């Protein structure tokens, strides 16, 4: 029955494999989008108010149902055919499906003359579709079906195709809503502040933040204030309580202080009462609120109405926005004050801003919902204006012409295309970085980009606290994978078994709590709240309970049985403070864990047995979760959980550590993400090395996707001979690194050989490189289109001619065909022409606008595709193919942060060799190891020697006590090798033995995208910028290198004044001006007629020539634009 330790390493990984058979790696994206389409769009459409318009006749126009068909593309002819994602990629279409809404317009004029007209399936917009979602044409297709459609079966999906560009929505971090968080700002007028970003269940407005603060000590005592929304002045809490109908101080403290035996709380609230005694009735308090507001009505009536509306709608919407909710709002605001007092009295800890239990991940669904709310509101507005301008004339109108569908369509398309998350007009208030271009450089880069999280703290911020690896990231975020540049700690990555909750309605839970012995908050007396336990659901205090323990037992039983409580519902019992917080909302990152009985796992051997035959008896992960054996625990419920790292922790020990565990890790290696799960032996490296590899696995070459032959990507690198690593971890089985690997096993020798590998460089074998070692192919796609925008000027693909075309370069166009497009198989060098495009003029009647190769490439045309774009003019894509043979300067890396460029390449006779004539493919310098402490590199090399000599794949899973260095060495000594991986090598040049026995063996190396040929650049008098006549910027522009301020300072320190003048004047922008010797302002010179005159001074004899930079002339002219007179006085 029990899984014994000897079977555990199989059982756990069997369980893990079942998880990845059920979910995958992009499950969060697909589930978010599916919830958005199934629920969020319908909720948004129904939550909009019916637009009642009347001059008389009236019309309501109620939207009642939505229909999202499959993605479809319509041609000029109008025939209807399904649009496949690959066709969208090739034709630069948007993989979107039409959204139709049912509309009901009832005519009501008078005399009960009512009649309803329903417009079924009114086309309301187009919604882009996430690939492999339920509403994707690739849904449920087999691998054969996907290959029939020219799709990769290993492609995870989880992205959109907007204008042929694959866009991926990055999950955005945000502070959780409807939760009270008591912080303390050191530099502020308030000692403690308790904030609550409140938002109603079905979002319709932004988060309304309410603060309840305490004024810092230094009138008599500490005063509690409340910064309500839409009010620009602090308001005492007692005033707010009275404005809600609680005038008696006893009632207010009944709502705030639940234990009247506690004078400390009492004296700390007393200043607030003493400050609010002149106001003692609800109307006067409402008048005070309205007066403190930023729109103080001259008459107290409208002041009181405004205060009523604010306190009913903007104050704590999550508690309830309807009327008669003042009791719930009063209880909740009293809870906020109670929490603030507990913090000020030291009875509760301040809340941690960085705790991921306090955060939420805004995924594709809830982000598209924000867009859709804004866009549907704008659409209903436009419909209101259109219908108003017609009914004002007293006649009917056609809603089909009122609905301008471009709002929703173009809005979603623009937002996903650019990443600016918001309305196109508010292009600066909008937050960019959402919806990035999917990284297709290697399969690991694609997976990681699809599992990418973002902390929008702002890269400019230099506070390290949000960048720090918090304790609560354990199991939810990769500890290693993070960019090492300016976004350290802000851009994160999901751990492998991390699941972001999609969201759920609290209705069944609330109904069960009602049927259960919970007492509502309006029905109780406050005297009961002392000993009772509060119950919050999605932040709303809904009631109280008397035995929280058996309530938690009941709820956990219900969630483990897949009863009314779904698996993703978090249920935290804080014991010391008697809250029970239940969460069903979306964005809660959680992970699966094995539940533990008294001191035993519930995962018995029968579950492993049924999981082994997963493909026959359809016993899956969901059956494991439904059995009550596995549980999803979120960051906030982990605080109440006692984990076992392994079932070995559940053994009874000579001194028991815990003996009351509640859960167990499925495997600790699941704390790593996609790119860190490729590192072998990451627990033997320094952690920065693991981070650098997690970044560098994403630039590694491989086969980024199986269907690369049909993709017209702008840039693509494919390795000739990708190999799976000889030394692998058990997590790559689910990353599909074995099916799409990104490196080669290289016989690497760590040695000092000729000095060409010093300081992070490598010596490669020229003979190996000749045999296809780390050879790659580079595919570059050029796009072009001939626009017939108007009869004024039209472009067209056609072989240009020297007699008709004007802007025709001296490059030869013979490689083009009569259609103007080069043919595949044609070898093209730099500056060559691949598309001959000519544009009609207003060298006559047509000018050359041909597409050249990006300079200095020298490839062969791989293929040419011609089609029609969305509007329907001819559209061409040409993929050119360039074989990249590794060379000096190309960057290579192992899986341990050990990067370096090729210093030199030696032939096989020049490389050092073992007694059996094995030469290293790569030689790396021993000095790269000691400071870096990448012992995982050495253990991987030794394990790889054992694996190659044994005919297996080494197990480098991080935390594995069945694999240590002594075992690997003992294994290697059985194959006739030195047990530590050393060998006697001979000098290739002289054949003499090397005195020091070299450490050599197979290690998995990666070829990175950074090849020297894509970086080398030179300039000598090339093109210049228009504004300031200085060299351009970039290799692509043939630009010059920037001689910056620091270079100026260095050369000033050198004392090199002529070199400094050469760099900053003569090699950048030499120029001449003519200055009036009297006024010092630039004069008018006419060198052809030799007439120089200053219009200002009315002189034409006292002019002087001045040699100045063009940028300085431009500066002085831009100062004269500002009415400044910079007078260059030559005397």
């Amino acid at each position: 029955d029990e899984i014994t330790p000897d079977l555990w390493q199989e059982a756990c990984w069997i369980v893990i494999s079942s998880y990845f058979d059920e979910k995958g790696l992009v499950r969060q994206q697909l589930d978010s989008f599916d919830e958005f389409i199934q629920m969020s769009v319908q909720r948004i459409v129904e939550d909009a108010p019916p637009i009642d318009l009347q001059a008389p006749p009236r019309y309501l126009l109620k939207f009642e149902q939505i229909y999202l068909s499959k993605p479809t593309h319509w041609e000029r002819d109008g025939a209807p055919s399904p649009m496949m994602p690959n066709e969208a990629r090739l034709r630069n279409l948007t993989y979107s499906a039409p959204l139709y809404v049912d509309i009901t317009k009832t005519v009501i004029k008078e005399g009960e003359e009512q009649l309803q007209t329903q417009h079924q399936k009114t086309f309301i917009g187009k919604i882009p579709i996430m690939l492999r979602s339920t509403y994707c044409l690739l849904n449920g297709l087999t691998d054969r079906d996907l290959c029939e459609l020219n799709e990769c079966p290993l492609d995870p999906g989880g992205y959109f195709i907007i204008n042929g560009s694959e866009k991926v929505l990055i999950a955005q971090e945000k502070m959780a809503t409807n939760t009270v968080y008591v912080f303390a700002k050191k530099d502020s007028k308030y000692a403690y502040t308790g904030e609550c970003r409140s938002c109603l269940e079905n979002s319709s407005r932004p988060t309304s933040t309410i603060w309840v603060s305490m004024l810092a000590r230094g009138a008599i005592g500490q005063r509690i204030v409340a910064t309500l929304p839409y009010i620009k002045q602090e308001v005492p809490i007692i005033i707010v309580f009275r404005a809600l109908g609680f005038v008696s101080d006893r009632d207010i403290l009944e709502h705030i202080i639940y234990d009247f035996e506690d004078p400390e709380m009492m004296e700390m609230v007393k200043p607030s009462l003493d400050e609010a005694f002149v106001i003692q009735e609800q109307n006067v308090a409402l008048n005070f609120i309205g007066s403190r507001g930023a729109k103080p009505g001259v008459t107290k009536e409208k002041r009181i109405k405004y205060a009523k509306e604010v306190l009913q709608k903007e104050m704590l919407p999550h508690v309830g926005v309807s009327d008669f909710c003042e009791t719930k709002k009063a209880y909740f605001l009293g809870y906020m004050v109670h929490r603030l007092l507990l913090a000020a009295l030291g009875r509760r800890e301040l809340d941690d801003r960085d705790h991921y239990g306090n955060k939420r991940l805004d995924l594709a669904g809830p982000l598209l919902a924000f867009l859709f709310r804004g866009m549907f509101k704008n659409l209903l507005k436009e419909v209101r204006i259109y219908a108003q301008k017609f009914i004002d004339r007293g006649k009917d109108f056609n809603l089909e012409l009122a609905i301008k569908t471009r709002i929703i369509s173009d809005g979603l398309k623009y937002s996903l295309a650019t990443g600016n998350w918001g309305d196109q007009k508010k292009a600066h208030q909008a937050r960019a970085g959402v919806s990035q271009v999917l990284n297709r450089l290697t399969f690991a880069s694609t997976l990681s980009h699809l599992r990418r999280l973002n902390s929008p703290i702002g890269r400019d911020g230099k506070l390290a606290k949000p960048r720090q690896l918090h304790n609560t990231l354990w199991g939810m975020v990769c500890p290693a994978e993070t960019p090492e540049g300016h976004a350290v700690g802000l851009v994160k990555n999901l751990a492998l078994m991390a699941y972001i909750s999609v969201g759920s309605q609290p209705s069944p839970i609330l109904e069960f709590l009602e049927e259960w012995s919970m007492e509502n908050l309006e029905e109780i007396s406050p005297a009961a709240i002392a000993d009772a336990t509060k119950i919050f659901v999605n932040g709303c205090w809904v009631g109280i309970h008397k035995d929280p323990e058996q309530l938690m037992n009941t709820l956990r039983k219900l969630r483990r049985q897949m009863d009314i409580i779904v698996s993703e519902v978090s249920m935290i019992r804080d014991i010391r403070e008697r809250e029970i917080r239940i969460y069903t909302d979306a964005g809660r990152i959680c992970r699966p864990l094995l539940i533990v009985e008294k001191q035993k796992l519930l995962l018995k051997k029968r579950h492993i047995d049924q999981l082994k035959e997963r493909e026959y008896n359809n016993y899956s992960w969901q059956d494991l979760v439904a059995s009550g054996v596995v549980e999803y625990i979120d960051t906030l419920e982990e605080e109440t959980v006692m984990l076992a790292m392994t079932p070995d922790d559940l053994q009874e020990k000579e001194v028991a550590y815990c003996s009351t565990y509640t859960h167990c890790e499925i495997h600790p290696s699941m704390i790593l993400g996609v790119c860190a799960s490729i590192i072998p032996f990451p627990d033997h490296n320094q952690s920065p090395r693991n981070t650098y590899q997690s970044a560098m696995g994403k630039q590694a070459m491989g086969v980024y996707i199986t269907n690369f032959h049909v993709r017209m990507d702008t840039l693509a690198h494919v390795l000739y001979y990708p190999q799976k690593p000889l030394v692998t971890t058990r997590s790559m089985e689910y990353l599909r690194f074995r099916e799409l690997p990104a490196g080669i096993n290289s016989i690497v020798a760590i040695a000092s050989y000729t000095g060409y590998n010093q300081e992070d460089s490598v010596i490669m074998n020229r003979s190996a490189v000749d045999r296809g070692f780390f050879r790659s192919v580079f595919y570059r796609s050029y796009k072009e289109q001939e626009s017939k925008k108007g009869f004024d000027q039209e472009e067209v693909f056609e072989k240009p001619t020297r007699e008709t075309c004007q802007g025709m370069r001296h490059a030869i166009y013979d490689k083009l065909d009569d259609d103007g497009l080069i043919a595949p198989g044609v070898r093209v060098s730099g500056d060559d022409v691949i598309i001959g495009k000519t544009v009609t003029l207003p060298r006559y009647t047509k000018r050359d606008c041909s597409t050249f190769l990006r300079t200095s490439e020298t490839g062969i045309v791989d293929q040419v595709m011609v089609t029609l774009n969305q509007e329907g003019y001819k559209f061409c894509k040409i993929r050119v193919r360039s074989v990249r043979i590794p060379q000096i300067g190309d960057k290579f890396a192992s899986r341990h942060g050990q990067k370096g460029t090729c210093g030199i390449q030696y032939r096989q006779e020049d490389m050092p060799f073992t007694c059996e004539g094995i030469t290293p493919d790569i030689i790396i310098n021993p000095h790269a190891i000691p400071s870096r402490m990448t012992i995982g590199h050495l253990i991987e090399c030794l394990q790889g020697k054992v694996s190659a000599n044994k005919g297996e794949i080494g197990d480098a899973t991080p935390f594995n006590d069945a694999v240590n260095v002594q075992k690997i060495s003992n294994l290697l000594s059985d194959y006739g090798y030195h047990l530590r991986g050393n060998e006697v090598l001979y000098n290739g040049f002289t054949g003499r033995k090397i005195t020091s026995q070299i450490f050599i063996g197979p290690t998995y190396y990666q070829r990175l995208k950074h090849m020297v040929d894509d970086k080398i650049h030179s300039r000598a008098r090339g093109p210049i910028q228009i504004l300031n006549r200085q060299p351009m910027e970039g290799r692509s522009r043939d630009g010059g290198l920037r001689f910056g301020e620091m270079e100026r300072d260095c050369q000033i320190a050198h004392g090199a004044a002529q070199f400094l003048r050469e760099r900053l004047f003569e090699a950048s922008d030499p120029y001449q001006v003519h200055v009036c010797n009297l006024c010092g302002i630039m004069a008018i010179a006419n060198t052809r007629t030799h007439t120089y005159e200053c219009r200002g001074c009315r002189n034409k004899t006292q002019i002087s020539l001045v040699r100045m930079p063009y940028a300085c002339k431009l500066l002085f002219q831009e100062l004269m634009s500002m009415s400044i007179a910079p007078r260059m006085m030559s005397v």
Partner: protein, 115 residues
């Protein structure tokens, strides 16, 4: 972009001499032999054969740059001898050694295939 053709390691450029002899002025009876389009394969054997001559006081070689395709062999001999004569005799001795080794390897192969 900058890859030299692989034959440039073996083939002489037009007007480029296979070997150049330059008198070393630091010490007497020393010469520098700059041999183009050769590498350690001939340099090592020529040096080691020259070291077998008791009339050779110095015999060394270097590949000044691996990316370049020449070697320099410095030979100093006793005053009654010459570095050019030493170099010639070293090549003659290497040729005779290789001829003998080839004939003996042919004989050994014949014995092995026959019995």
């Amino acid at each position: 972009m900058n890859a030299p053709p692989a034959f440039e390691s073996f083939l002489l450029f037009e007007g480029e001499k296979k070997i150049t002899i330059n008198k070393d002025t630091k010490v007497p009876n020393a010469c520098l032999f700059t041999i183009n389009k050769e590498d350690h394969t001939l340099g090592n054997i020529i040096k080691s054969q020259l070291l077998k001559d008791p009339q050779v006081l110095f015999a060394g070689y270097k590949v000044p740059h691996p990316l370049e395709h020449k070697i320099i062999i410095r030979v100093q001999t006793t005053p009654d001898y010459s570095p050019q004569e030493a170099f010639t005799n070293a090549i003659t001795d290497l040729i005779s050694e290789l001829s003998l080794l080839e004939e003996r390897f042919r004989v050994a192969i014949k014995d092995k295939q026959e019995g």
